[PDB]
Amino acid sequence: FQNDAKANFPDYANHGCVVGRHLNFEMYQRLFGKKTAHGVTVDKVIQPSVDNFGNCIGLIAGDEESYEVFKELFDAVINEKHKGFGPNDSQPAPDLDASKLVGGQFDEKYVKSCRIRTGRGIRGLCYPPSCTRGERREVERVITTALAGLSGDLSGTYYPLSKMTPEQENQLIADHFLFQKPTGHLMVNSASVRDWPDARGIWHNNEKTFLIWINEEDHMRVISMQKGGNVKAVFERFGRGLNAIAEQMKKNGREYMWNQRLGYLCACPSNLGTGLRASVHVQLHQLSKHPKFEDIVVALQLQKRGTGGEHTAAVDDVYDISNAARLKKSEREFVQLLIDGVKKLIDMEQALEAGKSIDDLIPA
Amino acid sequence: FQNDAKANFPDYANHGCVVGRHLNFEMYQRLFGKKTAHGVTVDKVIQPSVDNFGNCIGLIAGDEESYEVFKELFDAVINEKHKGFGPNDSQPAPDLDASKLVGGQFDEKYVKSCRIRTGRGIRGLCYPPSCTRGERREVERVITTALAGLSGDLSGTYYPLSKMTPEQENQLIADHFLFQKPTGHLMVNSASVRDWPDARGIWHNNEKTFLIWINEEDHMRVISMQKGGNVKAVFERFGRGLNAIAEQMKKNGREYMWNQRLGYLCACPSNLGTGLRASVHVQLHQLSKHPKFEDIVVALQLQKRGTGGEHTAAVDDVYDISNAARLKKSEREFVQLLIDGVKKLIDMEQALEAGKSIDDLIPA
Numbered sequence: 001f002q003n004d005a006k007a008n009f010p011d012y013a014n015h016g017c018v019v020g021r022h023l024n025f026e027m028y029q030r031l032f033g034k035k036t037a038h039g040v041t042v043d044k045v046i047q048p049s050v051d052n053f054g055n056c057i058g059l060i061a062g063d064e065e066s067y068e069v070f071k072e073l074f075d076a077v078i079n080e081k082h083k084g085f086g087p088n089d090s091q092p093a094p095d096l097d098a099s100k101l102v103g104g105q106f107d108e109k110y111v112k113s114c115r116i117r118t119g120r121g122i123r124g125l126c127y128p129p130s131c132t133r134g135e136r137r138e139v140e141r142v143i144t145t146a147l148a149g150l151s152g153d154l155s156g157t158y159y160p161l162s163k164m165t166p167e168q169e170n171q172l173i174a175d176h177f178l179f180q181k182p183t184g185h186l187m188v189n190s191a192s193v194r195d196w197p198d199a200r201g202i203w204h205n206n207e208k209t210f211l212i213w214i215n216e217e218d219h220m221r222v223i224s225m226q227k228g229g230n231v232k233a234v235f236e237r238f239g240r241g242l243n244a245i246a247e248q249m250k251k252n253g254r255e256y257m258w259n260q261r262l263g264y265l266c267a268c269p270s271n272l273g274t275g276l277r278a279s280v281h282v283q284l285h286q287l288s289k290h291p292k293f294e295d296i297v298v299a300l301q302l303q304k305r306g307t308g309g310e311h312t313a314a315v316d317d318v319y320d321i322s323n324a325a326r327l328k329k330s331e332r333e334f335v336q337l338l339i340d341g342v343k344k345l346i347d348m349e350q351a352l353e354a355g356k357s358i359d360d361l362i363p364a
Numbered sequence: 365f366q367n368d369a370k371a372n373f374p375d376y377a378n379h380g381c382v383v384g385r386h387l388n389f390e391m392y393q394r395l396f397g398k399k400t401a402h403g404v405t406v407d408k409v410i411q412p413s414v415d416n417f418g419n420c421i422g423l424i425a426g427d428e429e430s431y432e433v434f435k436e437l438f439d440a441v442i443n444e445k446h447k448g449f450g451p452n453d454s455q456p457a458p459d460l461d462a463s464k465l466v467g468g469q470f471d472e473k474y475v476k477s478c479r480i481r482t483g484r485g486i487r488g489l490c491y492p493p494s495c496t497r498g499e500r501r502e503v504e505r506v507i508t509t510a511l512a513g514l515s516g517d518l519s520g521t522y523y524p525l526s527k528m529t530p531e532q533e534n535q536l537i538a539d540h541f542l543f544q545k546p547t548g549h550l551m552v553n554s555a556s557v558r559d560w561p562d563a564r565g566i567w568h569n570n571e572k573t574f575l576i577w578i579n580e581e582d583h584m585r586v587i588s589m590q591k592g593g594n595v596k597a598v599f600e601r602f603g604r605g606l607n608a609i610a611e612q613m614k615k616n617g618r619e620y621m622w623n624q625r626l627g628y629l630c631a632c633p634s635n636l637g638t639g640l641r642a643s644v645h646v647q648l649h650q651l652s653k654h655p656k657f658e659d660i661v662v663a664l665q666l667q668k669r670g671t672g673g674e675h676t677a678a679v680d681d682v683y684d685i686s687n688a689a690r691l692k693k694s695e696r697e698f699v700q701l702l703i704d705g706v707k708k709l710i711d712m713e714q715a716l717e718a719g720k721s722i723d724d725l726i727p728a
């Protein structure tokens with residue numbers, strides 16, 4: 001008996017994962033014995049895809065180096081997932097300049113709130129699927145040390161999950177800032193929830209307009225938010241926050257994971273490039289009952305979902321609309337995509353309100 | 365930053381695991397960098413204990429070598445779990461001689477069925493927490509190849525979970541021979557359910573008196589059973605089955621995992637020595653309503669539980685009574701422990717049936 005590639009090749013029958021359609025034995029044999037500097041193997045990065053029979057992606061990176069050592073597998077998946085992204089295609093340079101936005105104010109009669117999120121990795125340390133307790137703790141240390149250097153309207157306080165009081169936990173729940181131990185297949189099967197809640201925590205400023213999660217699904221989850229429809233102001237704080245944290249991190253020789261081709265790196269290939277989801281809560285009483293509604297959203301390159309997030313129902317016809325893509329455009333440009341898209345949606349709503357047709361407002 | 369033992373030491377506060385009370389930093393530092401020939405680390409074997417806050421054991425072996433490379437941790441836990449087992453204590457030689465049993469027939473008026481189970485590991489291959497798809501498949505191959513050499517009343521057929529038909533699956537469910545993907549903390553947290561159901565299967569003889577599970581929680585789970593109370597006959601088939609399989613395995617240079625001190629090795633320290641649980645279904649209408657019932661069972665060194673197994677209620681006063689221990693006695697002697705114990709229970713029941721006292725039947 002030999003523990004070789006042939007003996008270890010996954011049985012992808014019945015699976016609906018992207019990986020199974022790209023990881024033929026030819027490729028597996030090649031990648032089988034490879035390892036990153038942190039010991040991440042091909043079996044590691046595909047484990048979730050094997051465990052799950054649903055329509056997953058199944059691909060997860062244990063560390064930054066995963067994207068280079070297992071480049072041909074990630075590129076194949078990335079290419080299909082992000083609807084076209086070859087080996088010579090490159091992510092545009094980061095763009096966090098809020099002042100370059102045009103008309104970043106929404107009619108607050110329809111737009112109730114604005115939210116912009118992204119994820120960062122701390123270079124040198126493994127992603128949650130592979131990180132050790134030591135690494136995870138260093139991630140928390142780096143981040144919290146940096147956050148404590150923030151001032152002004154970015155001044156905040158840190159709430160470690162492992163030292164959280166009933167009173168604090170209760171208030172964070174009411175704020176909807178608390179996160180539980182993940183239970184999703186990708187997180188569970190990738191061993192991303194080990195040692196919970198060791199070195200996990202929540203940070204937020206006094207205004208509660210800037211939220212930070214540590215060691216949840218990414219090293220750092222960044223969230224900027226405001227009531228109303230001033231998306232430009234939400235983006236301005238978003239970029240100013242990321243930059244400020246990065247500046248405090250340089251003091252300790254730490255930086256975000258980023259490279260010319262893929263932009264900001266994270267464990268989940270689906271969230272590469274900008275990892276940015278800009279969204280609004282927008283009320284669309286009439287448009288939502290229009291037969292072309294779902295097609296209009298897709299055409300605008302937006303995504304639609306319930307008020308309570310992914311896989312929830314929309315209450316009082318208020319929808320969570322956001323940019324659908326993550327790659328092939330800069331942050332500032334995705335935010336401009338949301339602006340243009342949402343205003344069009346609002347124009348259509350105001351047409352239906354006046355008993356008019358929207359037939360010639362639809363993206364041809 | 366250094367990824368050393370100090371940075372990686374588990375925070376055992378709040379935990380009710382045995383490991384936390386033995387794995388002080390002193391020990392952790394020593395074991396931290398160690399590895400078995402299969403790459404099993406200390407972090408691996410204790411991971412479940414860290415993940416779980418309940419009253420677990422939390423210790424699991426990735427391979428056979430785990431018990432030697434991490435000997436001082438396993439010995440500490442084993443010592444406490446099995447109520448006294450020092451470094452110089454030794455498990456008695458295996459004893460599968462059913463003919464050495466005395467009075468192995470139960471009053472079938474009270475004893476409805478008999479069951480005896482154990483677990484085996486195939487030497488050379490890793491336990492479910494650490495095994496690869498290749499290894500797991502080799503385990504299935506070795507076992508099924510051996511089973512196909514069995515004849516007579518040990519002739520049976522193999523039902524691979526990954527090629528199971530609705531009709532077969534339905535019949536196995538009715539027989540209560542099917543096992544699902546484990547969901548318990550120890551199994552989930554130790555990564556023992558990877559690639560389900562790849563290389564998992566069920567084997568049983570025509571009589572349905574001999575059952576075998578492959579790659580569930582152990583490499584091989586062996587179960588002998590009969591209606592009525594002829595425990596001697598159930599043990600006779602049990603031992604004859606284990607020996608026959610071992611004999612077919614030698615043809616291919618394979619053998620069970622076993623050593624002088626710990627007896628038959630398995631991933632779970634709680635099941636070392638004999639890994640043997642001999643049980644009966646015994647109806648105790650009157651005794652079960654006696655205030656001393658639970659104390660009598662413990663004194664007889666037996667265990668009591670519901671008819672549907674662990675954590676179930678007893679229906680019609682029928683209890684699952686079995687030997688409580690796994691170490692410090694031979695198989696044949698645990699079965700004799702069940703015999704002596706159950707007959708005493710039956711004598712007490714027949715006393716209460718006649719309105720007599722059992723005060724002087726109780727183990728002083």
Ligand SMILES: Nc1ncnc2c1ncn2[C@@H]1O[C@H](COP(=O)(O)OP(=O)(O)O)[C@@H](O)[C@H]1O
Nearest residue numbers: 113114115117277279280281307308309310320
């Ligand atoms: N524009 C918005 N305003 C207020 N809350 C929002 C907005 N967009 C999303 N949320 C909230 O964020 C939470 C997470 O949503 P989810 O669909 O998981 O997106 P993501 O995972 O990108 O945060 C949800 O409970 C939702 O209510």
Ligand SMILES: Nc1ncnc2c1ncn2[C@@H]1O[C@H](COP(=O)(O)OP(=O)(O)O)[C@@H](O)[C@H]1O
Nearest residue numbers: 477478479481641643644645671672673674684
């Ligand atoms: N003496 C017996 N006769 C018939 N069935 C039994 C007997 N003992 C246990 N069982 C059955 O075996 C199943 C597993 O029981 P469990 O408590 O998990 O013990 P184990 O894990 O050692 O098999 C249960 O559903 C139970 O009904």
